Design an enzyme around this catalytic site. Structure first.
Site, short mmCIF file in Angstrom:
data_model
loop_
_atom_site.label_atom_id
_atom_site.label_comp_id
_atom_site.label_asym_id
_atom_site.label_seq_id
_atom_site.Cartn_x
_atom_site.Cartn_y
_atom_site.Cartn_z
CG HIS A 68 3.41 90.28 -10.11
ND1 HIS A 68 2.20 89.63 -9.93
CD2 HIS A 68 4.36 89.43 -9.60
CE1 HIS A 68 2.45 88.45 -9.34
NE2 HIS A 68 3.76 88.28 -9.11
CG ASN A 127 3.39 90.97 -4.08
OD1 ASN A 127 4.19 91.80 -4.47
ND2 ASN A 127 2.30 90.75 -4.77
CB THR A 128 7.65 89.18 -6.79
OG1 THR A 128 7.79 87.95 -6.10
CG2 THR A 128 9.01 89.62 -7.34
CG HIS A 137 -0.02 84.17 -15.34
ND1 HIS A 137 -0.60 82.98 -15.76
CD2 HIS A 137 -0.98 84.80 -14.58
CE1 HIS A 137 -1.85 82.93 -15.25
NE2 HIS A 137 -2.13 84.02 -14.53
#
Length: 106
Positions: free
Chosen positions: A11, A35-36, A98
């Site tokens: 991330h 995806n970030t 997360h």
């Protein structure tokens, strides 16, 4: 994935102009549809999650650079979007691990 380190590689990024097709194709993602990726330092992000030790949700007060890849047309043909906005992450052990959401934390 499980710790702030693994969550960092998936991330976070070092280059603001990351290559979605060249990075996603890697076994780390395996041409993942989307995806970030974020653009910041480990000391600048660590200070953001160095407030709680237990498991809790924290929302960045300031907006951070966000370079994300998105499935625009399979197979591995993705696009990159750069926008500065706040993010909702789960803090644990003085570190984030997360990715919950953005300005809105579900």
């Amino acid at each position: 994935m499980q710790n702030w380190e693994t969550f960092q590689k998936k991330h976070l990024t070092d280059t603001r102009d990351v290559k979605c097709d060249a990075e996603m194709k890697k076994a780390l993602f395996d041409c993942k549809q989307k995806n970030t990726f974020i653009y910041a330092r480990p000391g600048r992000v660590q200070a953001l999650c160095k407030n709680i030790i237990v498991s809790k949700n924290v929302l960045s007060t300031d907006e951070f650079y966000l370079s994300d890849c998105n499935r625009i047309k399979l197979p591995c043909h993705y696009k990159l979007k750069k926008s500065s906005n706040t993010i909702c992450i789960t803090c644990e052990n003085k570190l984030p691990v997360h990715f919950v959401a953005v300005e809105e934390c579900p």
